[PDB]
Amino acid sequence: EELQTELYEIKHQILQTMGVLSLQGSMLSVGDKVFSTNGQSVNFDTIKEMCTRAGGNIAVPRTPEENEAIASIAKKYNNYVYLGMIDDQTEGDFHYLDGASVSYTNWYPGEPRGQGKEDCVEMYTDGTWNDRGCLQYRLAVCEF
Amino acid sequence: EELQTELYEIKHQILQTMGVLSLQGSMLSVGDKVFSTNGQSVNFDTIKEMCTRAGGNIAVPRTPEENEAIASIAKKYNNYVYLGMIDDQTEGDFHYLDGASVSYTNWYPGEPRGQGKEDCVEMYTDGTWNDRGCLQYRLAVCEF
Amino acid sequence: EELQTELYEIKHQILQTMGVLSLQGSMLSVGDKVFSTNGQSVNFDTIKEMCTRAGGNIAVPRTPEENEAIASIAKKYNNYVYLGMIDDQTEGDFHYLDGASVSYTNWYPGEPRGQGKEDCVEMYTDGTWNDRGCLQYRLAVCEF
Ligand SMILES: O[C@H]1[C@H](O)[C@@H](O)[C@H](O)[C@@H](O)[C@H]1O
Ligand SMILES: O[C@H]1[C@H](O)[C@@H](O)[C@H](O)[C@@H](O)[C@H]1O
Ligand SMILES: O[C@H]1[C@H](O)[C@@H](O)[C@H](O)[C@@H](O)[C@H]1O
Ligand SMILES: [Ca+2]
Numbered sequence: 001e002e003l004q005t006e007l008y009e010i011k012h013q014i015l016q017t018m019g020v021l022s023l024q025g026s027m028l029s030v031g032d033k034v035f036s037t038n039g040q041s042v043n044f045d046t047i048k049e050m051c052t053r054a055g056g057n058i059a060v061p062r063t064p065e066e067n068e069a070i071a072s073i074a075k076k077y078n079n080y081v082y083l084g085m086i087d088d089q090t091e092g093d094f095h096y097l098d099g100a101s102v103s104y105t106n107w108y109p110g111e112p113r114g115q116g117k118e119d120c121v122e123m124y125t126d127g128t129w130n131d132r133g134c135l136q137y138r139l140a141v142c143e144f
Numbered sequence: 145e146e147l148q149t150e151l152y153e154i155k156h157q158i159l160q161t162m163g164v165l166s167l168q169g170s171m172l173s174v175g176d177k178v179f180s181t182n183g184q185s186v187n188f189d190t191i192k193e194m195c196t197r198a199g200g201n202i203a204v205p206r207t208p209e210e211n212e213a214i215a216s217i218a219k220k221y222n223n224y225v226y227l228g229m230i231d232d233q234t235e236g237d238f239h240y241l242d243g244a245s246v247s248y249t250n251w252y253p254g255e256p257r258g259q260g261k262e263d264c265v266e267m268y269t270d271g272t273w274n275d276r277g278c279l280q281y282r283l284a285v286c287e288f
Numbered sequence: 289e290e291l292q293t294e295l296y297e298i299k300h301q302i303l304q305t306m307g308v309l310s311l312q313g314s315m316l317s318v319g320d321k322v323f324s325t326n327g328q329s330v331n332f333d334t335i336k337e338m339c340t341r342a343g344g345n346i347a348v349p350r351t352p353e354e355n356e357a358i359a360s361i362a363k364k365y366n367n368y369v370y371l372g373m374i375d376d377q378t379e380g381d382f383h384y385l386d387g388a389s390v391s392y393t394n395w396y397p398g399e400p401r402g403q404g405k406e407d408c409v410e411m412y413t414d415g416t417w418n419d420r421g422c423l424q425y426r427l428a429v430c431e432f
């Protein structure tokens with residue numbers, strides 16, 4: 001019976017810290033997912049490690065709203081973003097990093113194409129996607 | 145019995161994140177209320193939306209200590225602050241945004257006056273209040 | 289039975305806020321300890337008050353890993369760091385601020401020495417320690 005008062009305070013305090021981080025542009029909240037960036041431009045492998053170290057994962061949009069959030073960060077920092085998906089196994093079918101087949105997509109018209117040996121996916125500042133090599137310097141955006 | 149250990153860790157972690165935000169000037173804590181700003185100067189309506197989007201509300205002091213906190217942010221950013229109170233209905237009696245009548249006040253001597261058509265309230269950098277129109281650019285301060 | 293869903297969401301949200309603060313360099317997490325700095329260089333007494341106001345304490349490393357974390361902040365800001373330990377009572381034996389005798393140490397070779405009247409401890413940017421007077425301007429690093 002004293003849990004409710006205890007749980008309320010906990011939930012309230014969490015709302016406060018999330019409110020502050022949100023108000024100050026430190027992160028974006030979309031449903032249960034929080035997106036954030038450290039502002040750095042590094043390669044795919046480095047991004048993965050940065051996100052993992054923080055306890056999260058390299059961002060990947062699974063809905064238009066999530067896609068738009070990531071896109072907004074992309075245009076805010078004026079940089080393309082590496083997404084949490086690859087097709088290193090067989091070309092054409094992309095997978096999330098857990099192995100599951102990609103469902104929601106937002107390819108720029110004609111994409112994926114050009115290759116060949118393009119295993120990664122980048123997001124343009126308008127939110128559309130392009131398959132690309134994994135060694136370029138791109139904005140690190142993480143999901144928690 | 146494993147809740148206590150679980151609740152302790154949760155409370156501890158919350159204290160940590162609040163500690164960090166507090167240490168770095170990201171927010172101010174006064175009792176159960178957290179104040180924060182994104183540093184922007186915008187009109188009354190815009191401030192309201194900014195705070196609401198972050199899950200909070202435009203700040204309003206109900207005690208001298210809360211008033212002093214907001215005042216400190218005001219002088220830190222060298223800007224006046226719109227407060228969460230209006231008197232758009234009948235002139236003279238101000239109300240919080242939920243409708244309740246304003247209790248604690250800190251009017252600069254002679255205020256409210258001048259109008260007429262001044263429905264909003266701004267805080268000077270010394271913490272005293274002035275009634276003012278709602279279209280000026282003022283520091284956005286939110287409470288959570 | 290609805291606590292699990294409630295506790296999960298709480299734990300998840302906490303992970304999110306800690307993830308964001310961590311990703312952005314706002315703090316360092318080592319075991320159960322969080323380290324953070326406001327970037328300011330002030331004396332020992334001022335640091336203590338700054339940390340206490342934020343709900344934490346002036347940092348003190350009790351393991352090599354904690355020592356390395358603090359050291360990284362030290363070299364990041366290119367400043368030496370006052371640690372949460374003193375020997376104001378009798379010279380030679382240092383104590384944590386709760387009174388307990390210091391266990392883990394990492395003195396630079398030859399230290400402590402020179403004095404005499406050196407009651408505080410500073411960390412060099414390589415992580416080694418030096419006993420020093422308590423009135424110098426040093427990076428404020430707090431633990432939560
Ligand atoms: O499909 C695109 C396109 O061909 C680009 O112009 C090229 O720079 C990239 O290699 C590729 O990802
Ligand atoms: O009462 C004040 C005062 O008259 C000010 O000098 C004026 O600039 C504002 O209109 C008003 O809020
Ligand atoms: O032991 C050291 C050493 O002697 C330094 O060169 C001196 O600047 C300090 O007084 C002391 O902490
Ligand atoms: Ca390909």
Ligand SMILES: [Ca+2]
Nearest residue numbers: 113114130131
């Ligand atoms: Ca392509």
Ligand SMILES: [Ca+2]
Nearest residue numbers: 259262263275
């Ligand atoms: Ca009026």
Ligand SMILES: [Ca+2]
Nearest residue numbers: 257258274275
């Ligand atoms: Ca007036």
Ligand SMILES: [Ca+2]
Nearest residue numbers: 403406407419
């Ligand atoms: Ca000494």
Ligand SMILES: [Ca+2]
Nearest residue numbers: 401402418419
């Ligand atoms: Ca010495």
